[model samples]
Target: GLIVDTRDVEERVHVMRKTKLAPTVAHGVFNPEFGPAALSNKDPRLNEGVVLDEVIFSKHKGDTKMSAEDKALFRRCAADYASRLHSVLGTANAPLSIYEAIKGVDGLDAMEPDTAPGLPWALQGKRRGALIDFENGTVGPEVEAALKLMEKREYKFACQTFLKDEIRPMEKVRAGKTRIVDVLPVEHILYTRMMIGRFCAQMHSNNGPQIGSAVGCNPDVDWQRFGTHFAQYRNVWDVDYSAFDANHCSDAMNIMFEEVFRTEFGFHPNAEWILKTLVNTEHAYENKRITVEGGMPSGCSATSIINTILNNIYVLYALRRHYEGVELDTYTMISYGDDIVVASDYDLDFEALKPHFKSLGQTITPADKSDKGFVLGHSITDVTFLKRHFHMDYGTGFYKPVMASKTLEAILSFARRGTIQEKLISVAGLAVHSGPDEYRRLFEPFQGLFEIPSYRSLYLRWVNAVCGDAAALE
Candidate 1:
């Protein structure tokens, strides 16, 4: 059985490493109804990027409270990791070295702070209680009940119960204090524990089952809310006042959730109303503030590229232009900058779509001679390879794999000159409606291709940014 230690980080890492090597966790396990679906890639989330970030960034940046010498070591460690990773991926025996390289880099130090908050909700308005109360006591019953089920090793059942009684109610909690921090405590606990357990289970499924979440040994609480709060706070303090306006959609969404949840439920039901309002609002201020005096609070820069991508695809489909089938695939070339390869399967007569794309400065082209096609690669890498040669770190090498022609040009162009403002503003117009079929066409292909860990993380980010606390109810 995996040992349970809520406070012990080393033990937790040992168990997680074990589960990861297990065949079941790697290949999956089977269940009834959906048959092999549960055992397959249908896991609730995929977060390769987050994992990479944790692994790479921490290895590089060591402890937050580091000595000056330690800081230098951290930077060198990061550079070393990048170099090794690049060598492994670029070598002919990529897979062999890939596993080994990761192992060498693996340690108890991979985990770190998330850069953004998960989502927002108002618990008190929903009768869930405020963040302070929920964290202290009000949600104890629900959390305890969840822990009990989890200890019984009734994982699936416990998850369902936790989601229903604990998670959902907590979602009505205030965006940061309640819904995000307190309400989903078990959710984070279970997930982090699951990652540990599943990794261990992979090595020995019947190894008497590890202590699991029931033992109350929870993974370090990952408060994405704290990160988001800090990011916004920093932005407001350091950047231009106009920058706060950038987060208008996000702020409006959160405020709307607080208002609607209180008005409708006499407490927050969920932040769903806020999300819907933000999605539907033609003007941000109309729904965000009661008067000019209130203005907007900080925290609106909470945007997600994935949501922008979804909005962009929706716009393309809504225009009713016949698109060659969409190509959906994921690749990781850099940290926190995972790339989604969007290409067309069928031959796209560029002449037909050129004008529309040209108008927006979007680009397209036919497949290459090697059957490779032009693909849109969305990533965070922004510098030119040649000009920034001195800045070339090890991680820069592996990013070469995703070189689709048509989309690469624009991506590179954007990388060279793009700003966060440009991307957000450009993507904001992607809110137009598209029929269900088109939506399906856009996302269906990549349904199972992505790793759940990062996908869920990204999805949550998108949902939070686009829908904010408002979407919590939904």
Candidate 2:
């Protein structure tokens, strides 16, 4: 056990109450976006293989290549699209291997010393749910003997069958709601390590120079930049593909993935085998060996790396094609994963979006059916991306990055947990890590959830009373 205080529960509750955010402060910010949280009532009518089946056998006809027409039009426009397209794979200083770069990333490093890359994902797929290691229980070493063979691609004659790899119907709890997902089996170890290495290698270059456009895995771009655009452009629209599940089609992901490698590093297409090892084989369900024709293996960085680049391809292609001679000065487009934020001083050609996207096997979400598509006009002040509904009132110098009420409730719940102590030095050791203000002075300087300056004064006042006033009184 450990020591604790301050009538700690009371003060913690006060902090919780004070932290309750008004989600509707700026005109129904996310009232419509979050339709309902009751979406998790697992619909029993669906098949176990239904989601993956749809992805594997689905029809999507879209040319992912650049047209001579678009390229010619791009030359007439600003900058070079061809160079920009190739640059995702062309980061000159990318790391050598997958696990190499993440070695010293604050805490994720020390925990995963040897298998810095793949170990983080291992726990996500483990079905044998045993808690603790026998020989190595934080008191000893986790012999990642498999990782030793990782560096040398001592290729496998490993057997894979539909029966061997069953597609489990798995439910994921995301942001306090259930997300239905098609769970792929745990990957073959060496293939995963190699793929992880390739991911790190590409990520070093994946974050291209274009700031407001084509962002997926960039930490530098930050969530604040999204708000800054709203502050400037004043009007923003979010383009969500109507139930945009196009990325789930495994074939496109694999093709574009290899395309990324080849374009950047001039790798041979013969290497495509490495990309589809998960999808090429079949999976077993109900004793039926369902041959996996094409379905993006869920719960993997391959999907992250692949689709981010693929969307980059889609968005850029559309810009080059439809947006010819159109200056992006008034408007800027930023993509974080599948969701796109297009902020502008005025309305750009919002209607012509579907053809360009549908040409690439993606479709725009319908706003009100008919002519209205997913090119949503967020009434000049609101924009949603990466699940954060960003609102800016330039008049008040107010910026609110509001999430669901549940998330704010979660903040309240977490804020109320006073640090007494848990034994198990392993647990205590982990506690000390979170105890440090990663933001230095404040616990929740929160970007994406950044604390407002006026709000900061409220909490800083307490510190002043604790530090100076108490000293003066004594």
Candidate 3:
């Protein structure tokens, strides 16, 4: 089956929780309803034959006999109209085959390892044996020492931590249900791994000019790459992932860890066993039981480090193939987890790249194929023009300067024709002003804007500045 019905399993587990049953007893009850036996027996894809009860065809005007040429022309016109309507309405028809859709698209092609020239060893096969066997690859003394220390450290059960006790289910917006998420302990060994992982990442970034440029940390390099490409091609894409971290496989994580250590730094002592132990360990949720199929929980300390390293390696491999002849320092491929922004003078064949991604056990959704780039958390459009003008003031948090300008414009428009409400004035923090002249005097100099808590807060700050009040607003 393409999908599985686990709702019944979820319900039974919830019932056990409500009954205050012991953890072992709850597991005993759940195993029967949702275990391998139950899942194996319920294969929905085993239907006897395909059914097309509701399938219908369009009829030509009056069902009259028409010439073959005219019929062909009519079909073409109808298809063109339907395509335009789909684009405008944000509706899309599902393709019969994803591969067929790929072939149909212009400027998009798929390149598998076999077909892709100059494909890196890390991306070659399931074992990625070349990375493990690369020459001149060796772990630094510091890295080796860190690994040894990590090995010696007593591993703590995740459920035993204070953070485990702090785990609670929170209501999901619009879903009208709760999702159980656990917090990580700052003092846990997992936290230490996180710190080390970050250090390793920094090492990867600073290793060499090519490595630094390839790693997705430096914004200056990213901007330069975008600028160069935008000037030539005028097209850039920012890729997004649908629950990227949640979809990572444990085997892939282990493979990535092994490859990263072997290829980047060098071989470490007991690295295989250490990583295997960590990956094999099961995590516990407060009220709900997590299936093995689910991704590493969101707030786990190790999640970011593992994801960052693995995702970087994967993107780097793809880029290496996609931009083979190009110098690493010159080509631009920004990958920060699922947020990938690729810029090339040549239009990229995203359709061709899809299958390669699948071969590597990764999925790139079609939704990511748009925009300039996402930097720090802000989406930067027109990468060619808006490099320096992208102003974000931390004073009001994540508010843009343009937002304040727009708000001021709204206020000025109101002042000219409509009466200003006292509630609005108070909310904006503005002292009573007689007319547009007074408002202009206060707002003209403060054309800049930052993120504010609310519209009222934005007004209040502007008023506070105009009124010469040094006191801060709550």
Candidate 4:
């Protein structure tokens, strides 16, 4: 049994150490899904450079629609959570309704993701193409002008037809079997992000269990304490969302968030109707239009926060209730996004508590999955959390990240895909993923494979730009 303070898990501890041993690649593990991407020497996202296309259909048989099984569970959970929200905040004004949270929500002031996804490439200058030049750390003059053009485009058409006082359908795109995204109007998108930020800001005032939120999470900072976390607490259960695994899709049920906003953040619900209006999203694909009703805020950036905040309120509630029993606080939960770690007694039955979470309309992806290409939660100890593997050192009892195999594959695939820009983005991505030391170890092997002019300076600038530490380049 272990009883560590949540504070240690809640706050990050940064310790940087350079690995001295010769970096080696271990090669027994197999991943049928991710492995194919590396074998083709392509980016893991796989369908690279395809986002620039005007239309994209799922290349696989897997449809983008929610599964009947997942949808049934989701609907019951939605209904259950709604009644729960009513139970908690009955007839009372929401404590910090978004209206009071941001005072007024309109205009382009906080509008973000300002440029649409496929726009920059479509609008690029003829000769130089994309505005961001990897070779030189400079943006083209054509960049600002694009925004002005967008502004005019917005005004010209908006004043005429958009005066219909209606929320617009999103220019939605999906890549087969899963991962649906809806790129929306600049103002609509921005307003969602802004109110989301303010609500999270208020949640931060008295946060517990949720180590992060939309406004406050970094994967780099995430790992700084994981190794130590495993060392101190010998057990852990990794938790992930079963249905909302990749991009969580929840609509009007997110209205249950007002329950959290009012009870915890002191918010009131003046703008519920407006937010409801915003979420009844109609997704417009070239000729295939679909409307999602009963409200699911699928594509906007705030979607994760909806899951993160709701989870902690009782995501924490259930974990403590089921796991603690009569013991003297023998458990500590450290979580981020919808993924979490329950570190406590090795006797902790990871599967013993699924029904509690089930009641909430979302279920934890249990300890395993298969060929349908699935993601799942892991067992009571020696689990992977934060996307890094953590298993015991047996007698030594310290669990650390065994990163070489995947890192090695990353370097091999990244070992220059020919284009000058490919090598640069690959190395920068290497530093981003593998960090400084691992990068130098593998990158040193193929350092000179790159043959472009002034390549060394390009390497130094881009790596330094992405990493910020002088040591990253050195």
Candidate 5:
């Protein structure tokens, strides 16, 4: 066993607590006008006067914040946003890939679209809206500014500004900021999500989940475990530079990681995690300090993971609704940095569903091999773990009903509305001895839980004396 650092124990605990309590901005709230669209499948349940109600806004009003007329207009605006997003995708004859669809999109990258670029002329028209004039690449001042920010690699600032300026106010009117259109496929969303996560890390020198700060606990052991896992896939883990010659290392590591997915996850690790991890880990192993490397991988760098995970959540929603032929009651999910926990009323066969996901080790870790205390693999099981260990609960009965036109509608709705809740949900999503202050208190009762130097003994005694009943702390 690596010798535990008695002197640094207190500091580790403090850092852990601060990291957990630090405010994190979730991307769920941000809306790109170029994002997916709302599905248009009409339902018999819809009545002309049956208003749609949202926490932010409503379509109809019996007795609420806004008048019935105002509510209706807000819904119309939301509908317009959704429609515009769809228009950018073009049509079946002019099918545009997501990359192509974003070409004329304001505040997006300068990529080409498969179809001619233009904003919708009307609700759903072929003619261009003033939003995007492709010949000149001219857009409104705000859109132009956003595009410049993206070009400058100030993605976070740009995204947050867009959410506050465009998405939030519209959401306030009882409409969501995103639509449920099928502009991008599930696989694309998954790949993009990972790539984005890694890209952010690369640009900012931040670490992402799994291979980042989450490995802070028992850093030595974690690095070894990760290295071992990499080896299991093949001799793909980076070689010991001091021991191996350049030729041997290059040949072995190269071919090993080439078709790695074919042997491991059945698909390559998204370019995001793969490239970012390669760079970040190599830097860490060279630095020879677990703390620095562990701290380097911050949540900011993990935006791609968040995006990818949210996309998966959306995919799950669509599939559940399609297969069950019923509206999904909730889009409930929680995360502690990279770790995720989800719950839903949708029907799923826990036993029979194992094989489909076998290619990804996630299946083995969360299923068949599940064990008590520790669920399975490194990931914990769903809400069951939360309820049993953390004593928290969230479900349909806990909140009022929220309805949507279709599966995609529900996803878009949740994506826009559930931002605040998701951030709060993550606090207890995974336990880490509460916060820093609380953990220090707990250490008093179970001093054995930690190992520290003799000089620090007096500090602990002082802490216990001043902060009575450390175990009683929250």
Candidate 6:
């Protein structure tokens, strides 16, 4: 096992030096005694940029004690803000339909392209275009090198490419051009390729005995309800991340990737160009100035996929070391990104685990210590869960099935006017009906102020009406 502690600092340093993979920019920043050091010395000028801490903590900062009414009002405002934001910004810079986008595209369609059986049906047309594009397109040397390496098939590389990034200066949003944030073009071919690769990896992990089967890699709804039931029945820790996506060190990622790759495949490819070309890369903001990102930029599919896999492996390894003789079923550990829900039976000694993660340049935030049920996407604390389903203040507003409605809405909204609605209905498990009738049926319960039911009852009703699966709901 990797012994990383203050008592073994000399040995730790020796191992790190021997590997020749120690982080260059932030080497030894995480002290063996203190764990990962704070980023207090970061440039004050960078403070002008949008810090995630400000968004997460600022709203609830001074209200250590507040009236019930105030809390209710705050919750309402927050929910409303989120809904409005999604509504307004959802279609900003949206792309044209794949059918329209591919009107004049040519060549690869004649080349007898590789069948993309892994791609979802909705994306079949787009996938065809992408196959054509990849076949015809000329890539840079770095990308070419990556492609060549991928062709060997011994090493599994997450398909990644340079983002067509757009930088929005802080001045435009708030005050001045003191800071800039780059946004990835989600519709970019490379982004889709990465997403497809990530989805496939997730599917593999979800079914694989090593991780998913052992841990019960169930849906978010199952885990949310399961966690609540177990906590009430016994107790379970809801481990989560505080800016987990943003705060993880890219250097640590490089090190772990190399370690894991070398062990599993026995031959790690020299793919430094993948991370090197992407990390700290400059982006132009309104053609005014270039902004170099400090952390891994958001929207790259590799960012989330790589981070989640590596982090999970590290935690699993640490757990195995800590509980040597005990049959530690790693499969029971559920992780979707940074949101983790460990089965209560495992009895994880977080005190011992935290330092291990820290030694590897990761931090478990204080918020993760809470007993309250953590939110994993749509799932929240039992209290928050009920509020989300029943209370109008927290955006339910009525008896509308929040996630189901959104799912249906998203499918319809994106589909072209003449697109087959049944294809979507079949995939989404929605009831077969006329468009208007279906929409009306979906929203009928929430049309006015109405009686609220338990999520179990409501979900049952929803599944029966939409998916024809009332038994699962029960």
Error of 3 at 40 (Å): 31
From the highest TM-score down, the ranking of the candidates is 2, 4, 6, 3, 5, 1
CA deviation > 4 Å runs, candidate 3 = 1-156, 159-172, 176-182, 185-234, 262-278, 291-294, 319-330, 366-474
The top-ranked prediction according to TM-score is 2
Displacement of residue 373 (Cα, Å) in model 6 is: 13
Provide C-alpha RMSD values for all models, in order.
27.3, 14.6, 22.1, 15.2, 27.4, 19.5
Query: What lDDT does each candidate get?
Result: 0.23, 0.38, 0.33, 0.37, 0.25, 0.33
Tens digit of per-residue lDDT, candidate 4, span 1-474: 011111112222111122121212211222112221111112244344444122222211121334455445444433444344334434332323323322322221222212442222322223232443424422346444543443344311110001011111111111212233454433333234333445444333323332323224333333334456444555555566654422223431443443434433333343233244433444443323444433233455455555554554434434544654322145555555566666664455546556555544455654334322222333434455545555343422333334444544433432212343464454344343334455454445344455322434444444343245643434
Deviation in Å, model 5, residue 313 alpha carbon: 3.9
What tens digits encode model 1's per-residue C-alpha lDDT throughout 1-474? 010111211111010110111111111212111111111112232222223112211211110122345334323332333233223323221111212211222221111222211112211122323221332322244544654554454432100000111111111211111110111222223223222222222212111011000111110111122122222111110001111222223322333334322322222232233223222211111112111111122222112211222223322331233343331111011101011112222333334654433222233333222332332321123212111111111321111111222221222122112242343223221211122232233233234643222223333444444336634755
Assess candidate 2 and give its lDDT. Answer: 0.38
Q: Model 1, which residues run further than 4 Å from truth?
A: 1-274, 280-309, 315-322, 325-474
lDDT of 2 by residue, 1-474 (tens): 000111111111000112212222211322222222112123243334244323332332322443556443423331333245445545342222323322322211212223212222333333212222322322112223333333344432222211111111122111222222233322243234343444334453444325334433422124344455455564566666633442334434454555454424544332345555644433322223334334344444445445554555555556556655544343566665566666666655656777766544566663325456445445434455665565442322334344434333232222212321221111222112121332122223223432323333333332333244533554
Evaluate model 6: give its lDDT.
0.33
TM-score of each: 0.20, 0.51, 0.40, 0.49, 0.23, 0.41
lDDT of 5 by residue, 1-474 (tens): 011111222111000000011111222332322222111112122223332212111111111133344334333332332233223322211222333323422222333322322111111233222344545533444445544443344422100000111222222222332211111111222223233322222222222222222211222112222222222221110101110110111111222223211212223243323323221111111112121111111222233333233223222332332344422223233332334333333333333333322111112123122342222122221222112222111311111111111211222222333353452333211212223343243223223432422323333433343234542451
Residue pairs with clashing backbones, model 5 = 37-179, 37-180, 37-181, 38-180, 57-173, 57-174, 100-113, 197-304, 207-297, 207-298
Clashes of 3: 9
How many clashes in each structure? Answer: 39, 7, 9, 17, 10, 6
- Which regions in candidate 6 have their CA more than 4 angstroms from the true location? 1-235, 261-280, 283-295, 317-331, 344-346, 351-353, 366-474
Residue-level lDDT of model 6, residues 27-69, one tens digit each, is 1221111111111213233335654223322211110222445
lDDT of 2 at 277: 60
For candidate 4, the 10 contiguous residues with the lowest summed lDDT are 156-165
